[PDB]
Amino acid sequence: LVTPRVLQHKRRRIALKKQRTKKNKEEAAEYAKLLAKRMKEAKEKRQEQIAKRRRLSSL
Amino acid sequence: ADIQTERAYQKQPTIFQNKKRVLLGETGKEKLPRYYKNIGLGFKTPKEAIEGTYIDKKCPFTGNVSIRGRILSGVVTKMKMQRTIVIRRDYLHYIRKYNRFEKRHKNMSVHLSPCFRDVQIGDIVTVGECRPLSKTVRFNVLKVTKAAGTKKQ
Amino acid sequence: GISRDNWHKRRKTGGKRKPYHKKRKYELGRPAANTKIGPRRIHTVRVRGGNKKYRALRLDVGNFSWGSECCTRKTRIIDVVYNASNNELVRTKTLVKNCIVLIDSTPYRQWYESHYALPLGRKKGAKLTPEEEEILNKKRSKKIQKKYDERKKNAKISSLLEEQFQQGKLLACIASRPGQCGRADGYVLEGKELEFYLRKIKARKG
Amino acid sequence: ARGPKKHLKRVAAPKHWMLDKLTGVFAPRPSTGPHKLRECLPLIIFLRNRLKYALTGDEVKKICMQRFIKIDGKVRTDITYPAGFMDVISIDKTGENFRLIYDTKGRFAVHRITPEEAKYKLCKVRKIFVGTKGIPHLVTHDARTIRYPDPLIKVNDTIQIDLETGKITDFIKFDTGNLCMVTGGANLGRIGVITNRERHPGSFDVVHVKDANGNSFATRLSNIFVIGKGNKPWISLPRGKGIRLTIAEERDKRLAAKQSSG
RNA sequence: GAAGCAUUUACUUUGAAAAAAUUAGAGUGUUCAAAGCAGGCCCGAGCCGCCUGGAUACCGCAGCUAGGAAUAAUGGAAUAGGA
RNA sequence: AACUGCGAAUGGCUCAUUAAAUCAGUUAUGGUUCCUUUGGUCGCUCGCCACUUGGAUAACUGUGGUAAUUCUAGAGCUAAUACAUGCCGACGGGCGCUGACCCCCUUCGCGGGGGGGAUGCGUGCAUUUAUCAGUGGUGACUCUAGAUAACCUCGGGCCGAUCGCACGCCCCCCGUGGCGGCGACGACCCAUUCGAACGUCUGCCCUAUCAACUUUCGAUGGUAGUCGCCGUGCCUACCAUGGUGACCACGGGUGACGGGGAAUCAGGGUUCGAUUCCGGAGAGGGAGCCUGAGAAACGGCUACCACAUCCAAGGAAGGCAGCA
Ligand SMILES: [Mg+2]
Ligand SMILES: [Mg+2]
Ligand SMILES: [Mg+2]
Ligand SMILES: [Mg+2]
Ligand SMILES: [Mg+2]
Ligand SMILES: [Mg+2]
């Protein structure tokens, strides 16, 4: 029998879907900016190593 | 003589041979690519495994075995029983009451890949433990050391 | 039942060993599937851990790959023609892991006609006209004809595959294990192993 | 045996539990959980044998079923739940907030920490792998699976996570000169500074540790839990600070203590 | 510090790992003891409790690890295919 | 009461078997399975009931059978987190092939170099193949993740038709709907815990009045399979002729379960360990299975053998090496 308790349970299930897809989106965006800043640092260290090669190739 | 001496076609499973050989290539000479791997623990891959043409699915360098566990040594005693040799491992067993030793030995059958060509009786081999390869074979030859030889008559 | 234990074999020295326990459930075997060619019949068996296996008892279709062209099509299996283990597995038409089969070649040639726009496997041509002329020509545009010609310059197929496509049947090799997975999938034989297996099949003839 | 065992005899129990002999045949038999059987402390013995808030197992069962015992911020009602190392037990009716860390005898000591410290814990990275759709994961010395960690974090490093979110706050690398605690073996519970790590391919790596008094010792890499950046621990060390006293100087200290108070 | 050892072993010393119980052994007046793993200190009473233990050793041979290198075995240049 | 779920594979007992077997220390799974706990994951898929679909069956009523059992038949009801069947939403699209058409181009008659694109065909995880490139990782991958072409088993993989406790919030389009917190149960998969199973190295009593064994009917190895949870003569086909032994193989005995340990007591040693902890094995003897994550289970079943109980002689029921 359809009861407002049953409809409340259905709404609760849909709300769990909403909150977990929002969780996925937020986590992915935060990790995207983390993977920017990290290995942006590693790229600039490789550029520093290349600049060290250039510095020690002209003395 | 050739490598295709069985009823089934012998090939390395991870090499695709039919890679669209067209007129831009030479007919010949073509040489099909060779799969080999570096096993760890500081053991060099022999060059005969690099440009040999044998197919051996139990070879530690061109096959599907992985070396893990124990690394042992022994002396070759039999070289019958194709692609497999018998080595002998001598050791001393301590007996407490007489506080002396006695001399014991154990044979184990090991897989000898055809990347080791000049192997003779009396040679010292290094073996590495792998998964069971047959009823009695659990080790695989990694390195062959000659004994008092290299000069013949 | 049928058991695949170790303690019933003789020792390495040849000595006879005694059993110290009854045969356990974890060391059982089962009767072989003996997959044949016919309308599809698959029985499931409940296995260790509650998982499933699929005894393919009779199979008629399979998923085979060209490989050189990277074309995978479902196609019908016609016959078993060679087996490296046993000849009775050929004469009883049994599908096992490394057997050599004959498969229908129409999906592969249909992909070839649709992709390269060259007639493949045609004896004399201009016979199936109201389908083949419209599937080869299209009166297509210019740049698309240019890219089709760029495909056309690298569209040569070996002579063995050519005569097999003329015959309508291709030689393939199973790569899955029917009776474990319930499927008979594989690849089309090409090149050196095609020559090898053709020589073998010729050799048993006479 | 035809299946898994569900009992545990009393003399077969872990020694560091300090169970006696005459009070039973059986031992509490910790349930399956985020800690191993030999490296845990089920709630029944922590609540009955160490804190003595209970005298039997029924009293433990009812104070658990009143639903105020919190392990890592979650209410646990299973009286044989494996508590395990570096885990925070909060009572928060009496307001204790213990943490489980070894003393220098290799035994789980009662260690009261402040309410502000009970927000976080230290976890040791045991695996990093990439899951489906190319997203990385890590598995701690607990069963915790953290998704999207920092890409600088490698295996057998430690991470500071905060409870009730599970997110990573900070981490330190396993590097020479960092403070560590030994979490298994003969030197269990000792605290020192990493000086050397020599690698044995195939076999286990051994790490050489020097404590505050210069007593150098070695142990396997699996029994190393880094706890601080260089010299300062990130948690509160227990009484004794992980310095193992010899039996002679411990006897001297005990005699001096009984002379002062006696 | 990344890499390797100008032989490889035995030997010896060290370090890890060798269940608990039992044995040896530290502490503790079970009324003594065999035992046990406990206990001890102030109350003029709020004391709405304080201190402390539940060590340590040993665990053959085989396996792993780091120093020594005498003793014992073994190896390198003689058709030089030597460094 | 009964259906459903779970447990009954732990514990207890005994030491008959068992001599590189069991077992101990060591090591391995990069060669596998794993109920439960714990942590991840559960709008990632473009595709005329959803404000809830369908049929039964117990308990219950009632008519019985048999000498006899935890034996059950026929009739009439009624449930589900049992058994099935099956949407909506997210959902706007994105991405990859396909490309009729449309636009700017060397322009001269063309060769043109770039762009938009209607229409189609596919898409997620798991499965089974094949190909390509080389985000994290190990001493070492044929690892992990990615890309492509497909497949995806009707004894047919997931993508919630389940259940409690608080009861609240938004209303224009309009007051009749729409939203919400905390749990319980559930799940394909990954990790974790408890393991289990298979392996590596070394180690066992007496006997030669046991010196050669094994190999037709697998003995040792190779190739391809089959089966299995996986590695492997585990089994099959085709080959090769191997493998072990005076450093005691093979065979026989044991009044032999192994070990931690026990007695003795200069140092050495000699005996003992059925027996409360760990490991194994068995349930009168052999054999075969069902169910389940897990058993070749015996306080489960089937059969034979040996004992044995009740019977109205048609049948039926057994298993103390659990506690007494
Ligand atoms: Mg059950
Ligand atoms: Mg006996
Ligand atoms: Mg015994
Ligand atoms: Mg027992
Ligand atoms: Mg049994
Ligand atoms: Mg039985």
Experimental method: cryo-EM
Q: How far is D142 from chain A (nearest CA, A)?
A: 22
Report the distance separating Cα D35 and Cα D72, nearest Å: 13
Q: Given the structure tokens 């389908």, which residue do they identify?
A: C131
Ligand nearest, relative to CA of residue C24? 5
CA of C20 to the centre of ligand 2 (A): 13
The token duo for C121 is 């496997």
Q: Per-residue DSSP letters for D188-205?
A: TT-EEEEEEEE--SSS--
Report the distance separating Cα D29 and Cα D7, nearest Å: 6
Report the distance separating Cα A3 and Cα A35, nearest Å: 49
Q: Which residues pair with C55 in a beta bridge?
A: C43
Q: Which residues pair with D99 in a beta bridge?
A: D88
Nearest to D151 among A28, A30, A38 (CB): A38
User: How many CB atoms lie under 10 A from the CB of residue B84?
Assistant: 18
Backbone angles phi, psi at B114, to 5 degrees: -75, 10
Chains B and C lie in contact, requiring 3 or more CB pairs less than 8 Å apart: yes
Question: D64 with D76: CB under 8 angstroms?
Answer: yes
Cα Rg of chain B, angstroms:
20
Q: How far is A31 from chain D (nearest CA, A)?
A: 6
Q: Which of residues 3-22 of B touch strand F (CB under 7 A)?
A: 6-8, 10, 12-14, 16, 19
Backbone angles phi, psi at C84, to 5 degrees: -75, -20
Report the distance separating Cα B125 and Cα B110, nearest Å: 10
B8 to chain C: which residues are within 8 Å by CB?
Answer: 84, 98
In this structure, the protein residues whose CB atom falls closer than 7 angstroms to any atom of nucleic acid strand E are B 42, 92-94, 96, 148, 150-153; D 11-13, 15, 18, 20-23, 49-50, 105, 107, 184-187, 198-200, 203-204, 206, 217-220, 223, 247, 250-251, 254, 257, 261
Residue A13 burial by Cβ neighbours in a 10 Å radius (0-12, 13-18, 19+): exposed
Chains A and C lie in contact, requiring 3 or more CB pairs less than 8 Å apart: no
Nearest to B17 among C85, C192, C200 (CB): C192
Using DSSP's 3-state secondary structure scheme, residue D223 falls into: helix
C9 to chain B: which residues are within 8 Å by CB?
Answer: 135
Distance A15 CA to F168 C1' (A): 17
Cis peptide before D52 (omega within 30 of 0): no
According to DSSP, residue D47 is labeled I
* Structural domain spans, chain D: 1-116, 121-171, 174-244
CA of C21 to the centre of ligand 6 (A): 12
User: How many CB atoms lie under 10 A from the CB of residue D48?
Assistant: 19
C83's CB contacts (< 8 A; 6+ apart) are C89, C90, C94, C96, C98, C99, C100
Q: Given the structure tokens 């003779």, which residue do they identify?
A: B120
D37: CB within 7 A of chain F nucleic strand: yes
Angle at C9 between CA C4 and CA C12, to 5 degrees: 135
Amino acid at C28: L
Protein residue minimizing CA–C1' distance to F44: A21
Report the distance separating Cα D259 and Cα D254, nearest Å: 9
Nearest to D102 by CA among D195, D12, D225: D225
Protein residue minimizing CA–C1' distance to E51: D261
Report the distance separating Cα D125 and Cα C175, nearest Å: 40
* Structural domain spans, chain B: 1-153
Give the nucleotide nearest to D131 (CA→C1'): F145
Amino acid at B145: T
B4's CB contacts (< 8 A; 6+ apart) are B10, C196
Ligand nearest, relative to CA of residue D2? 5
Suggest the residue from D145, D148, D154, D165 to mutate for an interface test with chain A (most A CBs closer than 10 A): D148
Residue C33 burial by Cβ neighbours in a 10 Å radius (0-12, 13-18, 19+): buried
User: What is the number of CB-based contacts under 8 A between chain A and chain D?
Assistant: 15
CA of C26 to the centre of ligand 2 (A): 28
C206: CB within 7 A of chain F nucleic strand: no
CA of C19 to the centre of ligand 3 (A): 21
CB contact under 8 A, D152 and A38: yes
Backbone angles phi, psi at D168, to 5 degrees: -85, 125
CA of D11 to the centre of ligand 3 (A): 18
Neighbours of chain D (3+ CB pairs under 8 A): A, B
Nearest chain A alpha carbon to D147:
A27
Report the distance separating Cα C183 and Cα C37, nearest Å: 12
- HSE-up of C4 (CA within 13 Å, CB side)? 6
> For residue D122, what are the CA distances in angstroms to C16, D85, D90, D127, D221?
57, 10, 16, 15, 17
CB under 8 A, 24+ apart: contacts of A27-35: A27/D147, A27/D148, A28/D135, A28/D148, A30/D148, A31/D135, A31/D148, A34/D148, A34/D150, A34/D151, A35/D151
Angle at A25 between CA A19 and CA A29, to 5 degrees: 145
Bases of chain E below 7 A from a protein C-beta are: 3-5, 10, 15-17, 19-21, 26, 36-38, 51-52, 54-56, 60-62, 64-66, 75-76, 78-79, 81
The token duo for A1 is 């029998």
* Structural domain spans, chain C: 1-30, 31-105+169-206, 106-168
B101: CB within 7 A of chain F nucleic strand: no
D147 to chain A: which residues are within 8 Å by CB?
Answer: 27
Question: D209 with D182: CB under 8 angstroms?
Answer: yes
Suggest the residue from C96, C190, C195, C204 to mutate for an interface test with chain B (most B CBs closer than 10 A): C190
CA of C109 to the centre of ligand 5 (A): 61
C37: CB within 7 A of chain F nucleic strand: no
Give me the resolution in angstroms, 1 decimal: 2.9
